[PDB]
């Protein structure tokens, strides 16, 4: 896509998007432009014409979209990012959500196997990892992130059990041993669970901390997901 007067509509690996520095006069006045890559781009080095050249080169097959982080006019910083199963294009990282399932409950924490990563929603992907396609990796939900209205005395047994399916945002990468989750927001928590502590009817959220069993007649308390 056009963003100025030098952008390609369609890009591919190894194809220039734009020069590292630009210029155009808007209102009789030059505006130096300073381009940097983000995800789906790299700034790659070159020599051409007997001089060093540096340039913005697409890495991924897609539409060339502009976004921001922001001579005798300001420099304006334009990030360059070419967005295009797709677990090969995201790994768990910050600001991606993951779909996780509790593979062990513990005193101040919960090991939760990652079965899927959400696109950075309306655009969703599924992890290639499965317990039937082999390999596992896990991240941790802590006692501190369960809620955030009260959260330093709400234990994870009071809100979770094993086998519950939970949507959580990856808070940080953290330590190399785990991914640090947060379920704190009002759109994260248990997507669904099964009554009778993970053995009964399939139950869904009917309050933000109660899931009504359709087969026992009773509420099974949790932390819950919301839209």
């Amino acid at each position: 896509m056009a963003c100025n007067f030098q952008f390609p509509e369609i890009a591919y690996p190894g194809k220039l998007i734009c020069p590292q520095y630009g210029t155009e006069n808007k209102d009789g006045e030059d505006i130096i432009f300073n381009y940097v890559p983000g995800p789906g781009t790299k700034l790659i080095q070159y020599e051409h014409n007997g001089r060093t050249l540096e340039a913005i080169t697409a890495t991924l097959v897609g539409t060339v979209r502009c976004e921001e982080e922001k001579t005798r006019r300001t420099v304006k910083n334009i990030l360059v990012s070419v967005l295009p199963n797709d677990f090969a294009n995201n790994l768990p990282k910050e600001g991606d959500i993951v779909l996780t399932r509790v593979t062990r409950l513990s005193l101040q924490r919960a090991n939760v196997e990652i079965l899927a990563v959400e696109d950075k929603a309306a655009t969703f992907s599924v992890s290639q990892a499965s317990s039937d396609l082999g390999e596992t990796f896990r991240g941790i939900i802590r006692s501190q992130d369960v809620r955030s209205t009260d959260r330093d005395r709400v234990k994870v047994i009071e809100c979770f059990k094993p086998g519950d399916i939970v949507r959580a945002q990856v808070l940080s990468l953290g330590d190399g041993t785990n991914y640090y989750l947060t379920t704190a927001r009002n759109d994260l928590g248990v997507v669904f669970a099964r009554a009778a502590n993970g053995a009964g009817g399939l139950m869904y959220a009917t309050d933000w901390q109660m899931m009504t069993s359709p087969v026992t007649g009773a509420t099974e308390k949790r932390k819950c997901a919301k839209p």
């Binding site: 369609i10 591919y12 690996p13 190894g14 995800p39 789906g40 790299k42 790659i44 070159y46 080169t57 890495t59 991924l60 097959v61 295009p84 199963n85 797709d86 677990f87 090969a88 294009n89 995201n90 790994l91 768990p92 990652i114 290639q128 990892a129 396609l133 390999e135 990796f137 896990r138 991240g139 990468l173 330590d175 190399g176 041993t177 785990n178 991914y179």
Partner: protein, 211 residues
């Protein structure tokens, strides 16, 4: 026999015995894999089909690693017979090219599992040198389809059992192989293989353009 697999009678022994090419590409044709490619090359000499599948980015947690890594399995064809060691060499070769082409820094704790299936090779008329363009064509396509970052598309020719891989429009070389070619082929081969790379470059770009 063995505990992990059935191997039938063990005192039993095998049977004793008695641009000049067209590459047509395909992708995204089988699913349980993040991207796949198919390369069939036909030539006077021999016709060949190579399948590739690339699995992951996968997380490899319980350890922090400086950056990601690439792991290459070649699998012996069902109609071609090679020593395990040669497959290792070629795996090692391809890894060192891919190390240079795939950018690895957007992905901490990464291992990528690449599978090269060297399924069919058939002569109508070493050998392992000849299929290196085709392996490099296949795998690149697959990394592109999945959404794995790449510096430039990787691609190579074969001139006289000599394989030279370039990126950046013939300008840079990312690998060199010579095995049982003739002494002082250097100019002929580099000129001849540049032609080949520029020619298969655009083919891969046009496969990626139907999607």
């Amino acid at each position: 026999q063995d505990r992990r697999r059935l191997l039938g009678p063990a005192a039993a022994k095998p049977m004793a015995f008695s641009s000049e090419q067209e590459l047509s590409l395909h992708t995204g044709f089988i699913e349980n894999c993040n991207g796949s490619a198919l390369v069939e090359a036909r030539s006077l000499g021999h016709q060949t089909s190579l399948i590739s599948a690339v699995y992951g980015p996968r997380s490899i947690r319980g350890s922090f690693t400086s950056q990601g890594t690439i792991s290459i399995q070649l699998k012996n064809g069902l109609l071609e017979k090679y020593n395990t060691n040669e497959l290792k060499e070629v795996s090692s070769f391809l890894m060192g090219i891919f190390n240079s082409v795939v950018n690895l820094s957007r992905y901490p704790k990464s291992g990528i599992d690449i599978f090269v299936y060297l399924t069919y090779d058939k002569d109508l008329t070493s050998q392992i040198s000849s299929l290196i363009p085709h392996c490099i064509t296949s795998i690149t396509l697959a990394l592109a389809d999945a959404g794995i970052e790449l510096v430039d598309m990787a691609g190579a020719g074969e001139a006289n059992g000599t394989v030279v891989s370039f990126i950046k429009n013939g300008e840079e070389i990312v690998g060199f192989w010579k095995d049982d070619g003739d002494d002082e082929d250097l100019l002929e081969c580099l000129d001849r293989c540049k032609e080949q790379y520029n020619r298969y470059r655009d083919l891969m770009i046009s496969c990626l353009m139907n999607q």
